[PDB]
Amino acid sequence: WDVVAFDEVAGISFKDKDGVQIMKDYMASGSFARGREQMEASASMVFVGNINQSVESLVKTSHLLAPFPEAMIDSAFFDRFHAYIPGWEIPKMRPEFFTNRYGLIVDYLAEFFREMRKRSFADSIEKYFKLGNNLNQRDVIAVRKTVSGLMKLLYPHGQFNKEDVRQCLEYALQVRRRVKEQLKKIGGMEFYDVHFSYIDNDTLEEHFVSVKELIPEGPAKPGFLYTIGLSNKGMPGLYRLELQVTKGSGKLATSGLWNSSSAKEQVKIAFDYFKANASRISGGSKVMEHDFHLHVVELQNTGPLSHLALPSLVAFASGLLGRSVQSQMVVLGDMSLGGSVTPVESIAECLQVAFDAGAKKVALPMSSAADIPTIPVELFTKFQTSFYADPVDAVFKGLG
Amino acid sequence: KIAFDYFKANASRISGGSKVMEHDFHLHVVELQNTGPLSHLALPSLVAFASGLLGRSVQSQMVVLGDMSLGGSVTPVESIAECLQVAFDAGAKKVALPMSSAADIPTIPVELFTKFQTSFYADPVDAVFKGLG
């Protein structure tokens, strides 16, 4: 058969305990070794599942592949999916959704697909684009297969424009990034590079594609915070910093910085400040015995930010102390290596971004005091101003 | 009495079901620095009734300043700076302020103002919501 589709995958059960790695190998290489001989197959595997809960509930409480059986909840096994079709956005079948017009023959369709199986169009993306730096080689393979398949359905004649490959590439990136988020959720740290992007070959613009899916009510895990900053295009934007701390030797890793030099130098200055002022801030905890990895995730698609030293230092202090930053916290402003604070750009705009439903308390720097009158009274009264003076006081206000 | 009347009037907007008519309140004023009688006490009284009726503990080491009218109009804090040094000497960590006292922020020394976590309530109901945390 050309396609095998496991219906109601929640009910799949295999008598042979060795089968799981057999499927792992079959999806990994297209061939499986049984006994002493290796058999190849061209059958495509589909997994059909029923979703019982709401999308938001499943996203917040679990991973979207929750209906999969416990025995099949594995990182490597889920890594082999070429796509995830989120059927919840597809409406339930209605007769008005059923056409009454002309259409090609189903047998004829299956035919044309079967002969199209012999051909390939995964190289078309190479003509107009390059893939971003946040996708591994498995991601490369998956996106190439998906774009080739969409090209096979829509453009069998081989004549195509750049807009077509844009649409196919972005669709593939979105469907694979959904899987990337699911694997990150189920596996913890190993799937952190989830920020899918593609660089245009001519314009050098890196377009970031995010899936369709400021603060949750409740105190977050230490090492997590939110900030608002003025991006390279000048619009205020919200970003989330996520710090992972492990027992190490003072090493620093960064991700989600849009591969921006400015963000890297700012966080490096912040790391230097934290190491220099570790004793007073941590009360004795040694930075030299812990490795920190900071991640930036952008929720508003506003663009990369340059000013990131102060929130990164706050995340460092929170993670090293293991005590949660205050709930609904928004950290504003930047800092110098000498501890001098810079006034927050776009006070009104930043507070408006913070006004987005959920956030209540904001730490403002002292230099922004002269900018208080520029704030409308109604907006200013809705927020608790944890007015700090220096980055040490900023950290203390952020941790309460 | 004005604070109690306002508390009766706005029970729904503050408590969400806790009925004033079914409960009796006893308010007791304690002087700790021998400073003398005070006049402006309506807004702190309202905060007290709201906290007691709801059983919600007030935020630790916060100081509520300002007074209110019967209709809910808030009055600016007279001599906010001296009250701030008093709070700093008293061990206070948070301050509750109305909008009108924000115009008095520039007259406040920056060092003292940096020591308190202001919430900047606007409405007396908003004053309750800020106080309850």
Numbering used by the authors:
A (entry chain I): 273 to 485, 491 to 677
B (entry chain G): 545 to 677
What does the paper say about this structure?
Bacteriophage exclusion (‘BREX’) systems are multi-protein complexes encoded by a variety of bacteria and archaea that restrict phage by an unknown mechanism. The final gene in most type 1 BREX systems, termed ‘BrxL’, encodes a large protein (670–700 residues in various species), with much of its sequence predicted to adopt a fold corresponding to the chambered ATP-dependent AAA+ protein family, which are involved in a wide variety of cellular functions throughout all biological kingdoms. In this study we have demonstrated that the BrxL phage restriction factor is a multimeric DNA binding protein that displays ATP-dependent assembly on double stranded DNA.
EM grids of wild-type BrxL contained a mixture of particle sizes, with the majority appearing to comprise barrel-shaped multimers displaying seven-fold (heptameric) symmetry. The final CryoEM maps for the full size wild-type BrxL complex extended to approximately 3.5 Å resolution. The structure of the full-length BrxL assemblage was built and refined into that density using homology models of the NTD and AAA+ ATPase domains generated using AlphaFold combined with the crystal structure of the C-terminal domain described above. Ultimately the maps supported modeling 14 independently placed BrxL subunits arranged into a dimer of heptameric rings. In the resulting structure, each heptameric ring assembles via contacts between the NTD and central ATPase domains of adjacent monomers. Two such heptamers further associate with one another via tail-to-tail contacts between their CTDs. The buried surface area between adjacent protein subunits around each heptameric ring (as calculated using the PISA webserver) is approximately 1100 Å2 and involves up to six directional side chain hydrogen bonds and salt bridges distributed between eleven residues within each interface. The buried surface area between each pair of CTDs around the equator of the assemblage (producing the tail-to-tail dimerization of two heptameric rings) is smaller (∼600 Å2). The structural rearrangements observed when comparing unbound, DNA-free heptameric BrxLWT assemblages to DNA-bound BrxLE280Q hexameric assemblages involve (1) a hinged motion centered around a peptide linker (residues 469 to 497) connecting the AAA+ ATPase domain and the CTD, and (2) a pivot of the two CTD domains, relative to one another, in each ‘tail-to-tail’ subunit interface around the BrxL equator.
